[PDB]
Amino acid sequence: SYNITNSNQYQYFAAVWAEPTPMLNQCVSALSQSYQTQAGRDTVRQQFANLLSTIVAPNQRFPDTGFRVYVNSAVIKPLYEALMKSFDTRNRIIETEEESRPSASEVANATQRVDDATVAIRSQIQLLLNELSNGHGYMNRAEFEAILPWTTAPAT
Amino acid sequence: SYNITNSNQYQYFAAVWAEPTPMLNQCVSALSQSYQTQAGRDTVRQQFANLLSTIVAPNQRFPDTGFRVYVNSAVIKPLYEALMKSFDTRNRIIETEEESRPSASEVANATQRVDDATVAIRSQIQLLLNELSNGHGYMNRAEFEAILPWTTAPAT
Amino acid sequence: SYNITNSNQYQYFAAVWAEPTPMLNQCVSALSQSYQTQAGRDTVRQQFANLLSTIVAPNQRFPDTGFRVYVNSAVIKPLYEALMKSFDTRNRIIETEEESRPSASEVANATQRVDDATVAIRSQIQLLLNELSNGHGYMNRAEFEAILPWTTAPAT
Amino acid sequence: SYNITNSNQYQYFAAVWAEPTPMLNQCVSALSQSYQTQAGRDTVRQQFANLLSTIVAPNQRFPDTGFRVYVNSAVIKPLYEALMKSFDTRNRIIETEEESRPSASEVANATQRVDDATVAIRSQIQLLLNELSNGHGYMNRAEFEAILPWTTAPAT
Amino acid sequence: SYNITNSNQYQYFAAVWAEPTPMLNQCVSALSQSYQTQAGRDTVRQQFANLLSTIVAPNQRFPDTGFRVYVNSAVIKPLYEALMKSFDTRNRIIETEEESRPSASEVANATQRVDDATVAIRSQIQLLLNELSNGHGYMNRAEFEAILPWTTAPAT
Amino acid sequence: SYNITNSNQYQYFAAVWAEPTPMLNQCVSALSQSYQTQAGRDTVRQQFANLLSTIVAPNQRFPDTGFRVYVNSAVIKPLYEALMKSFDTRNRIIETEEESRPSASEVANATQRVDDATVAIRSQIQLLLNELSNGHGYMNRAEFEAILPWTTAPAT
Amino acid sequence: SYNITNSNQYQYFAAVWAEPTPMLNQCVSALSQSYQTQAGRDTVRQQFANLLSTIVAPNQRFPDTGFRVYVNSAVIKPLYEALMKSFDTRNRIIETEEESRPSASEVANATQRVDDATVAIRSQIQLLLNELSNGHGYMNRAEFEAILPWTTAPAT
Amino acid sequence: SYNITNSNQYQYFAAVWAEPTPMLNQCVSALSQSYQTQAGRDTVRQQFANLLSTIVAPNQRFPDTGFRVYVNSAVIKPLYEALMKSFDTRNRIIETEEESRPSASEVANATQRVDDATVAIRSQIQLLLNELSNGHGYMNRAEFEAILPWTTAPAT
Amino acid sequence: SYNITNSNQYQYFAAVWAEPTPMLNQCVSALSQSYQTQAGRDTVRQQFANLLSTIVAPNQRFPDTGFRVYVNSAVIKPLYEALMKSFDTRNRIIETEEESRPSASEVANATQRVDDATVAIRSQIQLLLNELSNGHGYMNRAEFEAILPWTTAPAT
Amino acid sequence: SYNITNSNQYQYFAAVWAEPTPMLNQCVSALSQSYQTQAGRDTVRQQFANLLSTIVAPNQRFPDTGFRVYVNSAVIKPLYEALMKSFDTRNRIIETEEESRPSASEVANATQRVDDATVAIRSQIQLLLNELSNGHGYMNRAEFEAILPWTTAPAT
């Protein structure tokens, strides 16, 4: 069966998989909304997490009856953490009592901070789209390989 | 029969199921009302709970004669807790004796709090509608799978 | 007879139908009134609900002797929830004992809130009118199709 | 006889007809009054409704012995809903106990709201007059056509 | 029947289809309105989403009795995400209590932000019109091809 | 009968037709009014929409007993979207409580914005007039052609 | 009788006629008043509209017992739309509560806007006078011609 | 009848005709005014356009009962586009708020630009006068010829 | 039928055709306007695009019943891209808040930029006129040739 | 079948192909717009990327039923990266708070930077046009060769 030991072959186990369908659809769910909210962007990242699960264990090899998405590869990982990060936060401070601080934006501490955050998530959501989908990132038993052991309960 | 043991295959048992009909109809019941009330929004969340039951046990597999809704998936779970949460509460304080505090809204503690809560539940009730229904979230014996055991009282 | 199973073909069953006559007439009943009331706008949405019923079941197909209105399509669904929602509420607070709070509107918590709500329901009631009626939204056995099964009690 | 089925030919049935005489006369009844009232403007719109009936059914075609007014055409529909809407409401708030709020208009919530509403209904009542009457809107068996079926009980 | 496995042939499945009629009509619904609103632009993008469904599955090939629109092609995808994005948001901040911040626009945080957003959605709505329609983007069994497998339940 | 399939012959179906009479008359209705209003310009565009219907279906060819106006041609389409767009909006902000912001136009956010919008709709309303009418845009069975199929229920 | 079909012969039907008497007299009614008003200039344009009717139909040719004025010719059309347009509007803003904004014209948004509008309508009202009357614009069965058909119910 | 095919004989069809009377009179209407305006010069060019129509079709030859003016010949075309162009525009910039920029013409961006434009339209309006009228430009069935076909419905 | 394969014979397919009538008329529509605008020049180029379609496919040869205009030839292509490009843009920067930057043109960044752009589009619009029309650019089955194959479904 | 190993024969696999139709049409979409924008130029490059895919794999040779465009050849590659690069960016800095920096262009950091960028993309868009199309760049099984192996699953 599959019997892994060498640690160098463990950079593709947990928090590095999904499927073309699940991932791409999640991204559209995000992009199609306003960036003046927390519910949306915050929950969005939390959506992607639910799919950032695992698949290849140390005993049952990757099946031919499947093709998952290595969420920590070429363009996905760097631009997906960079992307999901774009909506990190912002200098949110609603200085009020009931009425927003009267002369709040006279000599304030933010404006283009919120505006510029939006640009981040926005356009990166797109470049991701094309890269993500194509081949930059994808993998299956075909591309999942190196020098892997197989020796537990027989089945070949 | 079905005979489950591996815990990794238990993230889809209790408080994660329903059916297209029950769920979608509940959402309309909510959306079609005012957000200046507690009866409505509070009881609403309590409505969704009655449907957040369980279906797949450890012995009788998912039937072909059915298609339920995994209430803890892709878009539903993150935006449904975020949604149901939108009507968490608000800074409700009816400072009165019989007559609401005379000069209550002069230098008060709330206004857009109540207003902004409404926006939350409202628009998220919609984005949910389309996502929820489509395929983002749904499942049945067809999509309910991984590596599951079946060995109790024979019937195949 | 009709014998449906595939869930992907269930996004057009409950809370998604009506008829050109019923729907359009309901909209006029709404639009022709004042927006400084609750009886009207609130009951209005509740009117549309009574027509948001169902028609196509899993066994008796859509008849040639009919043409219903898919209330969850193109322009209707997004602008009808957005519309019906326009009269969500407002920051209604009649701070009084018998006499409205003397200096209530000196440094208050609302005005253009009520005013701006009216604009919402109002003009959207119209854009709806033209869109709704035309073809954006309508359907019948002619447009109600995909890949649907028919196999119960014979009648062809 | 007339035997209609195609839905595309149903955008001219209910709530879209009247006659040159009834409609124009109703408009004068409105225009000739003060806009500081509710009885007038409110009941006015309700007057136009009584005439917003139906005429062409699915079996007895439009007669040669008549010429009705399609209340949902060219200029009428857009400017008639816009018109009838002008007297939607206003920020009406008579803050009093018996005596209107003493210092009510010091730092208040309205003035040109009421004033500006009047301008709306007023001048639009006129532009309507000329447009409405001419040809922009009118119709009869001559202009009521497309590709309509006639096949029930014989009479030709 | 159709029996797909190669992942490289999965960049045209979900969230990449529609039809000439549905798509173009949705765009007009958008363009014909004011850009000083949220109901409109926000719900607009949500309209396009309802049509961003799927069509070609892994078993029933693209029919000759149809011609859909690949919403992720040549000009559509880049300028449609860029377009739908134009109405991302803006620096919306209605600093008020009832009365908009007195000296709000003296030394404020926005103006041409809202104005410039409008230009974005506006003109891009047009360039899209011509490109979208022509051939830049469209596809059917004629143009939907590469090296695709067909081997399940026989029917040829 | 008419039996169309080739998609390249679908850029002249929905939202691309009208008649010389309806269209030109609508334009005059617009031009003859003030540009310091929303009722007028907004409803205007909504007027043109009611005429932006369809005529040539896939089975009943264009008649000799008619001459419609292709609203998406030569000069009409580019300058009609550009025109109808001129009255997109403006930086409308009536900062007031009852009394317009005292020192509102000292160091404000708009003036020639409103003024310059008017110039847009205005003069383009004219250049349109001559172009629109002449031949730039018009069509009928005479000019509506390419390589179109005709094969359903016989009638020649 | 008259039996027109060719569309090229339809640029002189609706909204393009009147008579020397009606038109010239209307212009004097306008010119003889102040340009610091809305009643006058606004209603003026609306006056000219009432005369911008139609005369030559597709069956009863232009009579010898008449001479009308083609309101869309040589100098009339370009300078009449340009003229009627001169009184488009202006940057009208009466910033007041009861008392016009104290320091309103210190650093304001308009002055020569109103002044310069007056010059527009004024002098163009004159150049029109001479041009309009002479021959630049006028027509009758004598000048109304091209290649027109006559074939319905006989009368020659 | 006339039956043209050779394209070399199509440089005298659309946008190349008028009549001695219409054209010359239009030019005087222009020349007799101030060049410190937009209404005049702009509408002027738009006047000439209304006459820049067509006359010789591919089937009804040029009549003996007429003499039109080829607006794209010898001196007219080059000096008429050059002329009509003279009033292209200018560096118009009224830098003001209500009061023209105080020290606007100290170190400004224009003066002789406006002045020199006037000279252009002015004197070219004259040289045109003599050239235009004489013979440089004029034509009729006498001068309209080359090697043209005539073969449709007989009439000779 | 026509059966093309050799790629060298593909430099005259898409985005390289039109007709003498459509093209020349579009150019006049452009030239007759001011160059201090964006609506005009921008939409102009977008007008020419609508005509930059295709005609000669790989199976139905160029007809004798037609003569189109190869928009990518001799003088058209180089001077038409150069022309359409003349109105690329300019250093447009309206530095203002409501009042254009007081001392904006003292030590500014542009003037003859806008002025010089106008000269570009202007005069090139003319040289184009003569070249375009004559023979420099035109083509039909007569001039559309090289060594082209014809072998699909028989018809000769 | 095709069985490649030698790496020297891998400089024509990924990110080096397309087709005459797709590529040339994309270029026109770009060129026909203003260069004072980011949406356009930025998304443009992202458009070309979607077509910069791959075609020749290591097992299924280049077909006779096709002719693609090697996007990394003679003139395309050097001038296409140079071209697409022209719209790299610019010294974009909108120093403002709501009102662009008053004395921003007195002693600033840019002007001809933006202007000169436009020239880059512009004219190179053209030289590309002719080169790209002709033969400089194109290829197919005819020109795609060197010394390539073919030895997997038999089919000759």
Q: In whole angstroms, what is the distance from residue G109 CA to residue I61 CA?
A: 64
**Chain F CB contacts of H97 below 8 Å:** 111
Q: Are the CB atoms for C126 and C107 separated by under 8 Å? A: no
Q: Are the CB atoms for J117 and J87 separated by under 8 Å? A: yes
Q: In whole angstroms, what is the distance from residue A52 CA to residue A72 CA?
A: 9
Q: Are the CB atoms for B100 and B94 separated by under 8 Å? A: yes
The residues facing C69 across adjacent strands are: C138
**Chain A CB contacts of B108 below 8 Å:** 97-98
DSSP D138: E
Q: How far is E100 from chain B (nearest CA, A)?
A: 13
Q: How far is I101 from chain J (nearest CA, A)?
A: 6
Please give the sequence-ordered ranges of beta strands (E in DSSP) within D1-156, or none if there are none. Answer: 68-69, 138-139
Among candidate residues F124, J88, E90, the one with its CA nearest the CA of residue I38? F124
Q: In whole angstroms, what is the distance from residue F75 CA to residue F80 CA?
A: 8
DSSP D82: H
Residue where the block lists tokens 């542009």: I110
CB count within 10 Å of CB J30 equals 19
CB count within 10 Å of CB F98 equals 19
**Chain E CB contacts of F42 below 8 Å:** 34
Positive/negative CA dihedral, F4, F10, F14, F17: negative
Q: In whole angstroms, what is the distance from residue D27 CA to residue B130 CA?
A: 44
**Chain E CB contacts of F108 below 8 Å:** 105
Among candidate residues G19, G115, G54, G128, the one with its CA nearest the CA of residue G84? G128
A32·E84 Cβ contact <8 A = yes
Q: Residue C65 in 3-state DSSP?
A: coil
> Which residue of D79, D92, D101 is the best one to mutate when testing the C interface, meaning the one whose CB has the most C CBs within 10 A?
D101
Cα angle I67, H13, I49; round to 5: 55
What is each CA distance from F92 to D61, D110, E92, F89, in whole angstroms? 49, 18, 14, 8
Q: Give me the DSSP letters along A75-102.
A: THHHHHHHHHHHTS-------BSSSB-T
Q: What is the CA radius of gyration of chain D?
A: 21
D72 alpha carbon, distance to own chain's centre: 8
Residue where the block lists tokens 């004072």: J36
* Residues of H contacting chain I (CB within 8 angstroms): 5, 7-8, 10-11, 13-15, 38, 42, 45-46, 49, 52, 72, 77-78, 81-82, 84-85, 88-93, 95-97, 101-104, 106-110, 113
Q: Are the CB atoms for A27 and A78 separated by under 8 Å? A: no
H50·F126 Cβ contact <8 A = no
**Chain G CB contacts of F102 below 8 Å:** 95, 101-102
Q: Are the CB atoms for H27 and H132 separated by under 8 Å? A: yes
What is each CA distance from H61 to G123, H53, H66, J19, in whole angstroms? 44, 16, 11, 48
Q: In whole angstroms, what is the distance from residue H38 CA to residue H32 CA?
A: 14
Among candidate residues G60, G54, G56, the one with its CA nearest the CA of residue G152? G60
Cα angle C128, C129, C135; round to 5: 85
Residue where the block lists tokens 């009758």: G140
F42·C123 Cβ contact <8 A = yes
Q: In whole angstroms, what is the distance from residue B8 CA to residue J10 CA?
A: 44
| For chain H, domain boundaries | 1-156
Q: Are the CB atoms for B129 and C81 separated by under 8 Å? A: yes
Q: In whole angstroms, what is the distance from residue J19 CA to residue C102 CA?
A: 76
* Residues of D contacting chain F (CB within 8 angstroms): 73-75, 77-79, 82, 86, 105, 107-111, 120, 124, 127, 131, 136, 147
Q: For chains J and C, tell me whether 3 or more CB atom pairs sit within 8 A of each other.
A: no
I85·J122 Cβ contact <8 A = yes
Q: In whole angstroms, what is the distance from residue J100 CA to residue D3 CA?
A: 66
CA atoms within 13 A on the CB side of F74: 24
DSSP D96: B
Among candidate residues J43, J44, J49, J39, the one with its CA nearest the CA of residue J18? J49
* Residues of J contacting chain A (CB within 8 angstroms): 14, 42, 46, 49-50, 53, 97
**Chain E CB contacts of A125 below 8 Å:** 81
At I69, which helix (H) or strand (E)?
strand I68-69
Which tokens is E83 given?
A: 């377009």
The residues facing E100 across adjacent strands are: E96
Q: Residue A6 in 3-state DSSP?
A: coil
Q: Which residue of D has its CA nearest to F55?
A: D146
φ/ψ region of H31 (left if φ > 0, alpha if ψ in -120 to 50, else beta) reads: alpha
H145 CB burial (10 A radius; 0-12, 13-18, 19+): exposed
Q: In whole angstroms, what is the distance from residue G135 CA to residue G48 CA?
A: 19
Residue where the block lists tokens 């209105």: C69
Q: Give me the DSSP letters along B96-151.
A: BSSSB-TT-SSS-S-SHHHHHHHHHHHHHHHHHHHHHHHTSSEE-TTT--SS----
A126·J49 Cβ contact <8 A = no
Q: Are the CB atoms for J150 and J61 separated by under 8 Å? A: yes
Q: How far is F10 from chain E (nearest CA, A)?
A: 8
Q: In whole angstroms, what is the distance from residue A149 CA to residue A1 CA?
A: 9
Q: How far is E50 from chain B (nearest CA, A)?
A: 7
DSSP H111: S
- How are beta strands D68-69 and D138-139 bridged, if at all? antiparallel
Q: Give me the DSSP letters along I76-130.
A: HHHHHHHHHHHTS-------BSSSB-TT-SSS-S-SHHHHHHHHHHHHHHHHHHH
**Amino acid at residue number H78:** P
Q: Are the CB atoms for D3 and D98 separated by under 8 Å? A: no
A10 CB burial (10 A radius; 0-12, 13-18, 19+): exposed
Residue where the block lists tokens 């037709």: F17
Which residue of H7, H77, H92 is in closest CB contact with I140?
H7
Q: Residue B63 in 3-state DSSP?
A: coil
Among candidate residues A35, A119, A90, J96, the one with its CA nearest the CA of residue E108? J96
Among candidate residues A26, C7, A22, the one with its CA nearest the CA of residue B68? C7
Residue where the block lists tokens 């693209």: E62
The residues facing J69 across adjacent strands are: J138
Question: Residues 6 or more apart from E39 whose CB is under 8 A from it?
Answer: C79, C82, C86, C120, C124
Q: Are the CB atoms for I96 and I77 separated by under 8 Å? A: no
Q: What is the CA radius of gyration of chain B?
A: 21
Q: In whole angstroms, what is the distance from residue D116 CA to residue D125 CA?
A: 14
Q: In whole angstroms, what is the distance from residue C1 CA to residue H36 CA?
A: 81
Q: Are the CB atoms for H72 and H15 separated by under 8 Å? A: yes
**Chain A CB contacts of J14 below 8 Å:** 135
Q: In whole angstroms, what is the distance from residue E73 CA to residue J22 CA?
A: 10
A35·E113 Cβ contact <8 A = no
CB count within 10 Å of CB H84 equals 22
CB count within 10 Å of CB J60 equals 13
The residues facing C138 across adjacent strands are: C69
Q: In whole angstroms, what is the distance from residue E150 CA to residue B130 CA?
A: 32
- How are beta strands B68-69 and C138-139 bridged, if at all? unpaired
What is each CA distance from H149 to C97, H58, H70, J67, in whole angstroms? 96, 9, 21, 44
The residues facing D68 across adjacent strands are: D139
How big, in percent rounded to 5, are the helix, strand and coil portions of chain H?
40, 5, 55
- How are beta strands H138-139 and D68-69 bridged, if at all? unpaired
Q: Which CATH number fits domain E1-156: 3.40.50.300, 2.40.50.100, 1.20.120.70, 3.30.1320.10?
A: 1.20.120.70
Q: Are the CB atoms for F54 and F68 separated by under 8 Å? A: no
DSSP H32: S
H106 alpha carbon, distance to own chain's centre: 38
CB count within 10 Å of CB F150 equals 13
I46·J24 Cβ contact <8 A = no
CB count within 10 Å of CB H111 equals 10
Instruction: Count how many pairs of residues, chain B against chain C, have C-beta atoms within 8 Å.
Output: 82
Among candidate residues C17, C28, C15, C26, the one with its CA nearest the CA of residue C63? C17
At F68, which helix (H) or strand (E)?
strand F68-69
Q: Are the CB atoms for I117 and I91 separated by under 8 Å? A: no
